[PDB]
């Protein structure tokens, strides 16, 4: 279900500064945190999410 196009949802699981957030904090199951981080890492390629907050 979790999906690199869905940049609404992916914003809950990054910072102000566009760092991926750890499962520790968010409470998320670790299967899905793998899928999340992979989603986010594609999103950043396509320029839908940012790497940083310099721009």
């Amino acid at each position: 279900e979790i999906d690199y196009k869905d940049i609404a949802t992916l914003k809950n699981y990054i910072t102000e500064s566009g760092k991926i957030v750890p499962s520790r904090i968010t409470g998320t199951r670790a299967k899905y945190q793998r899928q999340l981080a992979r989603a986010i890492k594609r999103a950043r390629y396509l320029s839908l999410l940012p790497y940083t907050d310099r721009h």
Partner: protein, 106 residues
Amino acid sequence: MRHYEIVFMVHPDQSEQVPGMIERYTAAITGAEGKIHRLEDWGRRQLAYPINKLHKAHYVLMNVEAPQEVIDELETTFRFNDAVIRSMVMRTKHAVTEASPMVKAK
């Protein structure tokens, strides 16, 4: 015959040419016995960071059963074509005939 999913994005001054590119590529897939399970066109959207100096560019989704033979003609044309700045082909384990979250939200 495997399923793929092809986001590319396009130099915004050649938003002119976009439907002309689509109709070549979409034809050339069905030319070799393919499908096209959907196609969207999210239009001009703001980039999260500059690429080639460009703020803004013209995105295009496309989901596609095809062979590997046609997908390389498609990957090569993207590389040689200057108007297309950035490009992705993922693989996928089913088809996806649907709208995305990008079209639905509006």
